[PDB]
Write an enzyme that holds these catalytic residues in place. Structure first.
Site, PDB file in Angstrom:
ATOM      1  N   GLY A 188      64.867  72.986 119.724  1.00  0.00           N
ATOM      2  CA  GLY A 188      64.843  72.441 118.382  1.00  0.00           C
ATOM      3  C   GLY A 188      63.661  71.511 118.168  1.00  0.00           C
ATOM      4  O   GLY A 188      63.804  70.437 117.577  1.00  0.00           O
ATOM      5  N   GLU A 211      62.083  76.868 118.669  1.00  0.00           N
ATOM      6  CA  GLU A 211      62.457  76.494 117.317  1.00  0.00           C
ATOM      7  C   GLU A 211      62.564  77.744 116.450  1.00  0.00           C
ATOM      8  O   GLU A 211      61.932  78.763 116.726  1.00  0.00           O
ATOM      9  CB  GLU A 211      61.426  75.493 116.749  1.00  0.00           C
ATOM     10  CG  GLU A 211      61.608  75.165 115.307  1.00  0.00           C
ATOM     11  CD  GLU A 211      62.924  74.477 115.109  1.00  0.00           C
ATOM     12  OE1 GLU A 211      63.148  73.469 115.826  1.00  0.00           O
ATOM     13  OE2 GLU A 211      63.747  74.969 114.293  1.00  0.00           O
ATOM     14  N   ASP A 231      66.513  81.476 118.379  1.00  0.00           N
ATOM     15  CA  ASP A 231      67.755  80.865 117.913  1.00  0.00           C
ATOM     16  C   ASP A 231      68.513  80.400 119.144  1.00  0.00           C
ATOM     17  O   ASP A 231      68.912  81.223 119.975  1.00  0.00           O
ATOM     18  CB  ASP A 231      68.593  81.865 117.094  1.00  0.00           C
ATOM     19  CG  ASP A 231      69.849  81.234 116.466  1.00  0.00           C
ATOM     20  OD1 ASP A 231      70.434  80.327 117.087  1.00  0.00           O
ATOM     21  OD2 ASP A 231      70.266  81.647 115.352  1.00  0.00           O
ATOM     22  N   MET A 232      68.716  79.087 119.260  1.00  0.00           N
ATOM     23  CA  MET A 232      69.353  78.534 120.454  1.00  0.00           C
ATOM     24  C   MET A 232      70.739  79.117 120.703  1.00  0.00           C
ATOM     25  O   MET A 232      71.284  78.939 121.798  1.00  0.00           O
ATOM     26  CB  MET A 232      69.501  77.015 120.345  1.00  0.00           C
ATOM     27  CG  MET A 232      70.306  76.610 119.117  1.00  0.00           C
ATOM     28  SD  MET A 232      70.563  74.845 118.875  1.00  0.00           S
ATOM     29  CE  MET A 232      70.339  74.267 120.518  1.00  0.00           C
ATOM     30  N   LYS A 245      66.987  66.488 122.531  1.00  0.00           N
ATOM     31  CA  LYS A 245      66.913  65.161 121.908  1.00  0.00           C
ATOM     32  C   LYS A 245      67.623  65.200 120.561  1.00  0.00           C
ATOM     33  O   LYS A 245      67.253  65.987 119.683  1.00  0.00           O
ATOM     34  CB  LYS A 245      65.468  64.696 121.763  1.00  0.00           C
ATOM     35  CG  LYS A 245      64.580  65.638 120.990  1.00  0.00           C
ATOM     36  CD  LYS A 245      63.156  65.133 120.981  1.00  0.00           C
ATOM     37  CE  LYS A 245      62.163  66.269 120.967  1.00  0.00           C
ATOM     38  NZ  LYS A 245      61.938  66.821 119.600  1.00  0.00           N
ATOM     39  N   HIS A 249      74.450  65.856 119.150  1.00  0.00           N
ATOM     40  CA  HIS A 249      75.310  65.092 118.254  1.00  0.00           C
ATOM     41  C   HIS A 249      75.467  65.744 116.891  1.00  0.00           C
ATOM     42  O   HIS A 249      76.350  65.345 116.130  1.00  0.00           O
ATOM     43  CB  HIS A 249      74.835  63.638 118.121  1.00  0.00           C
ATOM     44  CG  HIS A 249      73.604  63.441 117.285  1.00  0.00           C
ATOM     45  ND1 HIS A 249      72.688  62.453 117.562  1.00  0.00           N
ATOM     46  CD2 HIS A 249      73.150  64.072 116.174  1.00  0.00           C
ATOM     47  CE1 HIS A 249      71.720  62.492 116.666  1.00  0.00           C
ATOM     48  NE2 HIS A 249      71.973  63.473 115.818  1.00  0.00           N
ATOM     49  N   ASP A 250      74.705  66.782 116.583  1.00  0.00           N
ATOM     50  CA  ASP A 250      74.936  67.471 115.317  1.00  0.00           C
ATOM     51  C   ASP A 250      76.076  68.475 115.369  1.00  0.00           C
ATOM     52  O   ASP A 250      76.462  69.002 114.318  1.00  0.00           O
ATOM     53  CB  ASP A 250      73.658  68.174 114.878  1.00  0.00           C
ATOM     54  CG  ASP A 250      72.746  67.255 114.084  1.00  0.00           C
ATOM     55  OD1 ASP A 250      73.138  66.897 112.969  1.00  0.00           O
ATOM     56  OD2 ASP A 250      71.683  66.854 114.593  1.00  0.00           O
ATOM     57  N   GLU A 277      70.419  60.895 123.583  1.00  0.00           N
ATOM     58  CA  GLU A 277      71.356  60.584 122.515  1.00  0.00           C
ATOM     59  C   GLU A 277      71.670  59.101 122.553  1.00  0.00           C
ATOM     60  O   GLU A 277      71.377  58.409 123.530  1.00  0.00           O
ATOM     61  CB  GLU A 277      72.663  61.364 122.650  1.00  0.00           C
ATOM     62  CG  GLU A 277      72.527  62.878 122.646  1.00  0.00           C
ATOM     63  CD  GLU A 277      72.523  63.469 121.258  1.00  0.00           C
ATOM     64  OE1 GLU A 277      72.688  62.685 120.303  1.00  0.00           O
ATOM     65  OE2 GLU A 277      72.379  64.718 121.129  1.00  0.00           O
ATOM     66  N   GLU A 309      79.187  61.313 117.445  1.00  0.00           N
ATOM     67  CA  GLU A 309      78.694  60.637 118.631  1.00  0.00           C
ATOM     68  C   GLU A 309      79.764  60.665 119.710  1.00  0.00           C
ATOM     69  O   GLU A 309      80.966  60.771 119.442  1.00  0.00           O
ATOM     70  CB  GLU A 309      78.294  59.191 118.328  1.00  0.00           C
ATOM     71  CG  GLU A 309      77.284  59.014 117.187  1.00  0.00           C
ATOM     72  CD  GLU A 309      75.914  59.618 117.444  1.00  0.00           C
ATOM     73  OE1 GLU A 309      75.321  59.460 118.540  1.00  0.00           O
ATOM     74  OE2 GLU A 309      75.407  60.254 116.506  1.00  0.00           O
TER      75      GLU A 309
END
Lengths: 344, 344
Positions: A188, A211, A231-232, A245, A249-250, A277, A309
């Site tokens: 990303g 990415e 695409d991850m 990085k 958390h998303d 994070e 989180e």
């Protein structure tokens, strides 16, 4: 025996951040710093540097300033002529210094009209499962709202941009796990600017910027940075090590585990996923470490309620669930962590 | 040597009041009190009383709750099952008790969409003389915006309604200047409900409710309360004494002095104008007394920038400028004052 009178003081909570927003937009804080350290300035002095013709500018300005000072965002002394305001440990981070950018873009984003109006519906997350307060509020995805209104798009990219370089400046001082790599895939990575920074601090790393194709197209050629689209969720390019990085958390635990499994596959044995994070501390208190995780968690609650989180414990749980063997935790500062997921 | 990392924590300032607004709208605080005092409750316990079917309601709810607890709006203990939240001296004023209404309507007004969106332009008051941020923001007077959108109108009247009875309950305990009147003209009394309350506590006062004709029309017949219409700027009906409750603070010094001169005329010798206001303390600190004047002053900055809170010194200055002979000050609590302007 309850004192409701002092209850009315809680209206200070919504006033303060809007007082802070005004002072920021008026450059109050830079003016005070360009006057030398431990310099407390008068309202008249400050407004002198403010481009206004308003007679009663100094009077108006104090209404904002003395609230900031009351709640300890400015230092306050009491001359005879009036009150006089300087920077303290809280407000010094509102002025940049050379390339060390300030937190201003992040404060201006998290208090933006669009964001704030979506905060009126965060209770809907409790009430109705899977509801997204921002999407209810504005009737469209957040990123859709970025594209249509550019003020919102520009503040977002400045906020995270600022955010990332403040965090990296501290990881570079403290985190030594970069010193002996020779390959790092940033998952990303955007156009790669964060990664091309890492390569510069550690040239020996051949960096890969992974990415979505529709992003890496415009990508400039950074030395030591190679763009590969993908695409991850369909896979991650093979590399000695991986960097995550502010990506975990998303996502909720399912899609995190999906990501981290797909990560595991590309890594070799002895490979590591670096995770950057903020970490929800096991015990919350009124302190920097806590709020650095509580406030992003509340932002996502409004914009991305699936995101969240996590604690050290929970992060290890994601790593073990994905197939990783050992996890090391390196706190940097204030709740920021670098974490390695090892494949042994 | 500046720590920008802990700067990112300042985003807590805009998050907190919106976390508080959510908890209020979810009745979090009543649920906790209906469980007995010194009762700390679990998220699962609290959501049990919340009308939702959402599986992950307790999880979502904690994201809100643990921010409140982190910044000391809830008491926090740490069982094994999780965190457990009670009321403390800050949050007990968020639950009514019999007729003692809470500060909730005031907190809900001062954080309302309309108000908050107008807070984005309070800097305009510094920049451009005489600009009104609410009117810029919404392109109409505040009271116009009340008439068109009723949610905003209803919250305003509830806020001040709440506000007034919290203040009066304390003036009745502490202020003895009511005990020996026999006539009181309330300037700007509305339909007279605040005044008909005063008459009931002190029946010996023949009360007069002085108010714009277009308001006093609907007025009900309250015992010991007489309605007379009129414009305080063209004159004030003659009476032994006058009452000014939160009227001086809506006006700049010119129109205050105008009001208080017109007051002086109707009073006899030895007559008194009773003023009920909050008073900006001579020295601001992080305390209830301060914020009870700073936050209304900031509200007006957005809605009524000509209005302003004042100090003892400044209030005496308005009284002497209007022709009043002596001024007595009786602090009630938390910055609330009853003040008499004497005509001798």
């Amino acid at each position: 025996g309850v004192n409701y009178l002092s209850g009315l003081g809680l209206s200070r909570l919504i006033c303060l951040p809007m007082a802070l927003r005004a002072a920021i937009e008026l450059n109050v804080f830079e003016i005070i710093s360009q006057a030398g350290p431990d310099a407390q300035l008068s309202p008249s002095d400050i407004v002198a540097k403010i481009p206004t013709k308003n007679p009663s500018a100094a009077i108006s300005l104090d209404r904002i300033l003395r609230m900031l000072g009351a709640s300890s965002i400015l230092s306050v002394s009491t001359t005879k002529s009036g009150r006089v305001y300087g920077l303290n440990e809280e407000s010094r981070c509102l002025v940049a210094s050379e390339d060390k950018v300030s937190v201003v873009p992040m404060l201006l984003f998290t208090s933006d009209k669009a964001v704030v109006e979506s905060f009126y519906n965060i209770k809907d997350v409790v009430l109705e499962e899977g509801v997204i307060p921002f999407d209810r509020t504005h009737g469209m995805d957040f990123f859709q709202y970025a594209g249509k209104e550019q003020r919102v798009n520009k503040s977002f990219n400045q906020a995270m941009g600022a955010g990332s370089t403040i965090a990296f400046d501290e990881v570079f001082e403290v985190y030594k796990g970069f010193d002996n790599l020779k390959e790092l895939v940033d998952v990303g990575g955007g156009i790669g600017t964060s990664l091309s920074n890492i390569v510069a601090k550690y040239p020996h790393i051949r960096g890969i910027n992974f990415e979505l194709p529709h992003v890496i197209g415009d990508a400039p050629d950074y030395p030591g940075v190679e763009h590969v689209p993908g695409d991850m969720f369909e896979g991650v390019p093979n590399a000695q090590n991986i960097l995550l990085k502010w990506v975990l958390h998303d996502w909720d635990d399912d899609r995190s585990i999906k990501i981290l499994k797909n990560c595991w596959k590309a890594l070799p044995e002895n490979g590591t996923v670096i995770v950057i994070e903020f970490v929800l501390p096991q015990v919350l208190g009124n302190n920097a470490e806590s709020f650095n995780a509580l406030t992003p968690d509340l932002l996502m609650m409004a914009l991305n309620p699936g995101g969240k989180e996590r604690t050290t414990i929970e992060f290890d749980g994601l790593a073990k669930a994905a197939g990783f063997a050992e996890t090391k935790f390196f706190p940097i500062s204030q709740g920021l962590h670098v974490m390695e997921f090892h494949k042994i």
